Design a protein around this ligand. Structure first.
Ligand code: CA
Ligand code: CA
Ligand code: CA
Ligand code: CL
Ligand code: CL
Ligand code: CL
Ligand code: CL
Ligand code: CL
Ligand code: CL
Lengths: 258, 258, 250, 247
């Protein structure tokens, strides 16, 4: 299936590892031009692989919580390419800020998660209009299921779903589609590192995986990326405002199944 | 139907007008004790009518965006009554902060809407546990439908739905239920005043009302209040994490109907 | 909270035990007049308690799968009371008809679960229009969660949610509201017919216990009342968090 | 994007026109082998175009309301191809059976719309297990929005959404994914009253195309959707979920 993404310029936030890295790599494979915005430099191996598929792919160091850096990085991207065709809002962290944590911790969580999705759309949308481009917001099942000690991240991820509907309405006349992908349990190096802090990492991984209905396994970053890149493409030309769950049945299938 | 809310102490934010006022009044009618947190003093007729139903009902002047004022007003409420049985998070404003407004405007919208729902829950929850009390979060259809030039409000209202699920999970063992009510178009004095700024206020009102499937009319504050107060009561003793739409069919019925 | 249901005539299908029984009992407590349509006679204790609350409460023996019996029982209800103010579609059975069962078994499940919700609405709607009455359809979380080995029941319960939206649209200009309640795990005779219990109870997030028929009834009766006067087309989940809260919680 | 559907055998019910036809054609383009089950023979122009893309694609005349024809047509497909990799349940008709119509008309609507989705799954699932294949159920926005005067179709379409969740659960351990696509307004043979309706579609004020429905359906059949199961994908230009008040 030709996604018609050749030479389309797409910014991917947190685009050098995990879900974001898989999205950047998939974009390169579809002959698009991914532009990675991330705090820390990508691995050499990642950059080598990306450049091999798409020599024009770029990486810009960006602290997304710094509004001026978002502004300037988008400006640099437009200066380089003259156009923007997509934005994937993906950077985030489940920072475990519960009800008990208080205002400052809650607001800091909104800065880490929610506020830069808005900032990035704010700076990208004026350019997406010209190309009838697209936005994909990566959210989390926690936006609708809860988790229990993560008010900051939950609030952020839910606001991202709401903003997906809002921006779809706002941009309908410009032909700019806005959709979300909702993962549940996705195996990434960061998740693997977190699991490694447990007494028995293999048992902890198995305990989490056991609850995923389809195959009792984690979703892969590639699985998230395939749906996200489909949504960026005109193959999804009448899909806007939607929340696509790519989660092995985690959110919607009977909790009682084993 | 006996709601068993007699002598139960319930804080209602923005509780002296519109939806909040109707919730306070219904609470008083059920012989609960509403405690109004609002920036401005309620009008005299409101206070008289409230006291007539419930002499112990109180008002505290509170700027909800000031964390210390939330903290101190909750403390004052505990000092006066010795207990807390419910929290209704209701204060908000649709401030029309679009994609083009930028960071400072978007964050200010979060402060006006989202952040004080968290602050109030943060300060109230430790007390609600002792009484196996309840929370109701008043949201907005815009959280799921979008509207188009109100990113700040939409994000806030969607985060409030997500937090409803989150807090329901967090507090399940303590028997504290958390639910949301989602209005669409509700006629209030403030809405009436906004409409009065148009060239032809009556035609504008008609334009909006024509789109509400059930009766082609606005929902009333009392209609919102009756579902909200039901949700505060042990009549809703196995309802938690839910979003109840009270909207005349606005959100879910075929857009094509006249 | 006054529900203003006094003297309102409400048919409750399967209304003499479990969820249906609690709905009838709650209606009687609110001084409404429940009219139980069910295949088998209610037990004496149920009738004693029901009549103590509402002496005019009635039971009519009805095989809901017989269209003629539905028609005639609605007519009999109108002959006795002169009006109809509510319909609660509730009768059903999780009959475990899976993918391997075949057409005939699947269709039989639709007859046992779905088709009489339509038939009852068909015969009741003209009377409900006259009183600007209300419908509540009792569905099941299985409509949205699935379960396994129960295609017939799941299809039926999902169709009932769809019909709730459809009838809400169809009847909006007549002021007849139509809503659904979605239970998950509720202790009833149907349930015991369907250890495994303790295992299932542990999976209900709120209190690790089954929902009570009384809890389902309180929401169902609220939805019949003018306290829900701008609620139509809605699906109210009364399930202790079963459907919507994180599957991983203990 | 390689969908890895090459030589995969997929039955498409009502697969010779409208949405079904577009799904069959897209499958052929992706080098899958669509097998059209439909009441009437497709037109020669369609068959020519289908053969140009996939010479192995076939059509079988099937009255889906006849359980035996379903059984025998599935058997013939397995005899011919040796495998089944996908089922697309799509055949149906909005037959306008309302509250006033009565039992017989309502049940006839269920036969026309709902019952053959079950029948086809019943006969296809053993073969789908063998290939770790997939099912896509095409539903309708009416399942969640209502419409008026169409209880039969609405009930059927809602049951199909429920069955998507049910079969996803039932078949999880066998690696068989089950998903649904929910169109709203799509210009087809089954489909000023028109200008009125198109104006209400938020994205572009125009109907969704069969090609758009097909692109999502075929993606869902493919291993690119390897951890998607039980889901309802709305492909509707924002019809179901965006603010009703927008112009
Ligand atoms: Ca397209
Ligand atoms: Ca109770
Ligand atoms: Ca895959
Ligand atoms: Cl205020
Ligand atoms: Cl503050
Ligand atoms: Cl019965
Ligand atoms: Cl099964
Ligand atoms: Cl056909
Ligand atoms: Cl009708």
């Amino acid at each position: 299936m030709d996604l018609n993404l050749q030479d389309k310029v797409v910014i991917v936030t947190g685009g050098a590892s995990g879900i974001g890295g898989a999205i950047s790599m998939r974009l390169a494979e579809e002959r698009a031009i991914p532009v990675v915005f991330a705090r820390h430099a990508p691995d050499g191996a990642f950059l080598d692989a990306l450049a091999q598929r798409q020599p024009r792919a770029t990486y810009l160091p960006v602290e997304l919580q710094d509004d001026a850096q978002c502004r300037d990085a988008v400006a640099q991207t437009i200066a380089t390419f003259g156009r923007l065709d997509g934005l994937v809002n993906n950077a985030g962290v489940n920072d475990g800020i519960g009800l008990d944590a208080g205002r400052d911790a809650f607001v800091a969580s909104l800065e880490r998660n929610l506020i830069h999705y808005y900032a990035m759309a704010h700076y990208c949308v004026p350019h997406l209009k010209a190309t009838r481009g697209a936005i994909v917001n990566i959210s989390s099942k926690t936006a609708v299921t809860g988790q229990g000690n993560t008010s900051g991240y939950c609030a952020s991820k839910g606001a991202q779903l709401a903003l997906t509907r809002e921006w779809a309405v706002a941009l309908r006349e410009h032909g700019v589609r806005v959709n979300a992908v909702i993962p549940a349990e996705v195996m990434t190096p960061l998740y693997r590192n977190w699991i490694a802090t447990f007494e028995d990492p293999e048992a902890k991984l198995a305990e989490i995986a056991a609850k995923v209905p389809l195959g009792r396994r984690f979703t892969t970053p590639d699985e998230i990326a395939d749906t996200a890149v489909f949504l960026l493409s005109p193959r999804a030309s009448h899909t806007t405002g939607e929340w696509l769950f790519v989660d092995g049945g985690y959110t919607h299938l009977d909790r009682a199944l084993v």
